Design a protein around this nucleic acid. Structure first.
Ligand SMILES: [Zn+2]
Length: 465
DNA sequence: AAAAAAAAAA
């Protein structure tokens, strides 16, 4: 066995990994130096009878449900084959914006189809990585030897390829975006091996904790999209405390922001202000507090990694940062307040699709679920097992109804049909139809997009009648 | 060993 990178991409029918369903999946395997191993993979997913796609999404990808209905297979066979690629030992699974999007989709596909939601990402020396954050880090820290497009720097993949001399034909097709991803990976590793190798070696959470010192509030440069392009997605942060409820989260202070509220205000108002919209503040200062999830490949380094001139380029004032840090180190009651902001319960939906983060499944249940996968769908009803987790019973019905409709008996068929009738209410279809209509006018002068809106209208019409 | 449901990238 040898270490490889697996570049992957999804195209989905919507922006919500739990409720929306996937459409296309692509992947290429490569060695340490980015050379294709074997054949690229690209497949579709046959969307079930209880789902209509977001019009927005179909407009973006050009993939109609009929398209995926034809050349794709059920979500259970989709899941199974992505699973076998993802679980090849010593694989680093990566992509573009895959940590916040694609991996979430992956987790839910496994959850719905009885695979471990997470194992693919740690077991047999597996790991994940996000290339979007690397591009951003490169622009902030070591921009020399690459072109960065503007409008303010854009990190949309189609722009970064075009503005560097790489084929970018038919974007938002999965296979092409993987190729472009591979493209940016080679470039940066060539032009900036120092930063690239550093970033890769720091994808794992244990290396990152080596940088984080709560008691000293030792400052760090942090590149993250939430900081905004108007300052290169970069600032100097300090760790105040480990999040009281989430163990993979550290509470940072953005030293570039205004620390009046933290000194002045108390626990509750601050929480209110933090979740106050950027527009409803009036004159009030923003809370310069941000969570960093150490399992989500965040970009962190020692302060001096942002070099004097680079900080000059992005317009980050170092003196004002050092000013803030020194006041904070002398004002420990601030640790109290920021902890308190995050130390308050939550309610999930009664929809089992949206329940992955209810908690891990036990050993006993995995066994159970392992046996589910090993049973012929036609013998599932006869299977005599009991599950501890309330979720599993509910997932199993959905699995069966969505992937194996013919294995349902009469009463289960009647149950399913009631589900479908509860999804496709009159109020919902009107909302759906209203949206298509709106888009049809908004694109009256576009044959390509109206044909899609027509297609979506037809698919909706047949799937509910 | 694994998680958590403002800015800008999907
Ligand atoms: Zn894509």
């Amino acid at each position: 066995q040898q270490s490889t990178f697996l570049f992957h991409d999804y195209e989905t029918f919507g922006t919500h990994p739990a409720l929306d369903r996937p459409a296309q999946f692509a992947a290429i395997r490569t060695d340490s130096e980015f050379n294709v191993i074997g054949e690229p993979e690209v497949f579709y997913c046959k969307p079930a009878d209880d789902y209509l796609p977001q019009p927005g999404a179909v407009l973006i990808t050009g993939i109609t449900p009929q398209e995926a209905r034809a050349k794709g297979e059920n979500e259970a066979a989709f899941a199974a084959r992505i699973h076998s690629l993802f679980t090849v030992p010593k694989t680093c699974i990566l992509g573009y914006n895959n940590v916040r999007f694609d991996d979430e989709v992956t987790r839910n596909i496994f959850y719905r189809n009885f695979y471990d939601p997470y194992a693919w990402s740690w077991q047999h020396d597996n790991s994940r990585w996000d290339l979007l954050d690397v591009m951003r880090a490169c622009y902030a820290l070591r921009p020399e030897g690459i072109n960065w497009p503007e409008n303010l720097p854009s990190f949309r993949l189609e722009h970064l390829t075009k503005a560097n001399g790489i084929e970018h034909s038919n974007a938002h097709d999965a296979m092409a975006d993987v190729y472009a991803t591979i493209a940016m990976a080679k470039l940066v590793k060539t032009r900036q091996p120092r930063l690239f190798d550093y970033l890769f070696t720091h994808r794992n959470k244990h290396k990152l904790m080596a940088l984080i010192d709560v008691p000293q509030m030792k400052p760090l440069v942090h590149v993250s999209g939430m900081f905004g392009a108007w300052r290169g997605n970069t600032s100097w942060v300090a760790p105040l405390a480990w999040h009281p409820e989430n163990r993979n989260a550290v509470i940072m202070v953005d030293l570039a922001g205004d620390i009046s509220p933290l000194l002045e205000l108390d626990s509750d108002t601050l929480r209110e202000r933090l979740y106050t919209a950027k527009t409803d503040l009036g004159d009030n200062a923003a809370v310069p507090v941000k969570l960093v999830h150490i399992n989500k490949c965040p970009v962190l380094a020692q302060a001096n990694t942002l070099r004097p001139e680079d900080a000059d380029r992005l317009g980050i004032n170092r003196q004002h940062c050092l000013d803030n840090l020194k006041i904070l180190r002398e004002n420990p009651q601030v640790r109290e307040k920021v902890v308190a902001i995050f130390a308050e319960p939550f309610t999930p939906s009664d929809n089992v699709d949206a329940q992955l983060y209810n908690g891990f499944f036990s050993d006993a249940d995995r066994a159970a679920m392992k046996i589910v996968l090993e049973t012929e769908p036609r013998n599932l009803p006869a299977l005599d097992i009991t599950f501890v987790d309330k979720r599993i019973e509910k997932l199993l019905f959905n699995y069966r109804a969505r992937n194996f409709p013919g294995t349902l008996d009469y009463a289960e068929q009647q149950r399913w049909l009631e589900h479908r009738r509860q999804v496709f209410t009159p109020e919902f279809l009107q909302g759906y139809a209203d949206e298509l209509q709106m888009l049809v006018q908004q694109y009256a002068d576009d044959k390509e997009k109206v044909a899609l809106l027509k297609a979506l209208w037809q698919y909706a019409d047949e799937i509910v009648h």
